[PDB]
């Protein structure tokens, strides 16, 4: 019954085409509730969930201010990291940042995160103790030394333990009808002669699911879980069989693991 | 009626300290961040300090950095400005302001005069 709140930031430099493109997206479990886009006209943080729209305008002012501050920080860090790696000004580079907190069923803090990336590879991450940093290369050791000399991990730990957890509790209470739901999969099996058997799992929330194929009780194509577009998720698994097979589905909403056989 | 009331202003010797207060009424003072704005006679408005609704974030103008302290106590609905090492340049009318927002809520005080001279 644990819950999480995550924030994802992407900043891509566009040399010769203006300022870097900045995207900020907030998540509670698998549901997105806020979004900021630098290319949008409003230039404000915007709701993406119905339960977050009940917040006052001062909340959105504060969110817009903080997200624009983060955008400026990433904009400066793009040039700093271009200097670190001896990269030219012609190419485009990406900085990705993710942070958040984990909460339990009791509402108590479990885990805090902050991971940064440069060009799709790890750059620097906070350790599980929320006190030390892990650097991936020599350019990241400069950042690690700067952040240790600035005691940045202390402020980050304060945010992760205190502010993130309380606001996650508030969001979970505001969206208790949606965030605390668990939809069992709508499960069915299909047969197509080549032959193959496809085990469908549709309309389940959250996105964590396990589909396993067993031949007489022994484990053996599997597509990744994909969004249905309406707050639910879909997945299927396939097995090629000659002209005795069972598919097993495990989900939070399902009381017991299903055991599906053809026909 | 949404109202802001200033007190604690007056004449102060150069180099001494002084504290200003804002009493808030008619609105949920604890929900919003508050500003201090000063205006020297015959001059424009100059933002001094801001405190967030919970008091975690405090920012100051470069002219008053390290000398002015801003604080709130949400129980009595009061905003505080503590001014130390006051110079003659600090002579102005000081306003506590509930404003600077996108939804159009703007509440000013009546203004308290601080005069710094020998």
């Amino acid at each position: 019954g644990s819950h999480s709140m995550r924030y994802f930031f992407t900043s891509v430099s566009r040399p010769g085409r203006g300022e870097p493109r900045f995207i900020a997206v907030g998540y509670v479990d698998d549901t997105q509730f806020v979004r900021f886009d630098s290319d949008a006209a409003s230039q404000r943080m915007e709701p993406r969930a119905p339960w977050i729209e009940q917040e006052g305008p001062e909340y959105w002012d504060q969110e817009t201010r903080n997200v624009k501050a983060q955008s400026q920080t990433d904009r400066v860090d793009l040039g700093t990291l271009r200097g670190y790696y001896n990269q030219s000004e012609a190419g485009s580079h990406t900085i990705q940042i993710m942070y958040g907190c984990d909460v339990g069923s009791d509402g108590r803090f479990l885990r805090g995160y902050r991971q940064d990336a440069y060009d799709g590879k790890d750059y620097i991450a906070l350790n599980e103790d929320l006190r030390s940093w892990t650097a991936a290369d020599m350019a990241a050791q400069i950042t690690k030394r700067k952040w240790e000399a600035a005691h940045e991990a202390e402020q980050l730990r304060a945010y992760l333990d205190g502010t993130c957890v309380e606001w996650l509790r508030r969001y979970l209470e505001n969206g208790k009808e949606t965030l605390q739901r668990t939809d069992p999969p709508k499960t069915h099996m299909t047969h197509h002669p080549i032959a193959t058997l496809r085990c469908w799992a549709l309309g389940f929330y959250p996105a964590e699911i396990t589909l396993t194929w067993q031949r007489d009780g022994e484990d053996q194509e599997l597509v990744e879980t994909r969004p249905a577009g309406d707050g639910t998720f879909q997945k299927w698994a396939a097995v090629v069989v000659p002209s005795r097979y069972t598919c097993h589905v495990q989900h939070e909403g399902l009381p017991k693991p299903l055991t599906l056989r053809w026909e | 009626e949404v109202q802001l009331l200033e007190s604690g202003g007056g004449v102060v010797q150069p180099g001494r300290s002084l504290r200003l207060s804002c009493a808030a009424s008619g609105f949920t003072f604890s929900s919003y961040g508050m500003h201090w704005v000063r205006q020297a006679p015959g001059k424009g408005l100059e933002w001094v300090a801001v405190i967030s609704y919970d008091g975690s974030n405090k920012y100051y103008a470069d002219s008053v950095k390290g000398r002015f302290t801003i604080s709130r106590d949400n129980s009595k609905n009061t905003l505080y400005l503590q001014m130390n090492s006051l110079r003659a340049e600090d002579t102005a009318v000081y306003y506590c302001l509930y404003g600077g927002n996108s939804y159009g809520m703007d509440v000013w005080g009546q203004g308290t005069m601080v005069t710094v001279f020998n």
């Binding site: 924030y7 900020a24 907030g26 504060q62 969110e63 903080n66 997200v67 501050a69 983060q70 920080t73 400066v76 860090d77 700093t80 990291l81 670190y84 942070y99 940064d116 750059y123 620097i124 950042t143 700067k146 952040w147 600035a150 940045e152 402020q155 980050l156 304060a158 945010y159 502010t163 993130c164 606001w167 | 967030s52 975690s56 974030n57």
Partner: peptide, 10 residues
């Protein structure tokens, strides 16, 4: 909510 604290930067 997002982080309101300022950092030194990379």
């Amino acid at each position: 909510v997002v982080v309101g604290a300022c950092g030194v930067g990379k």
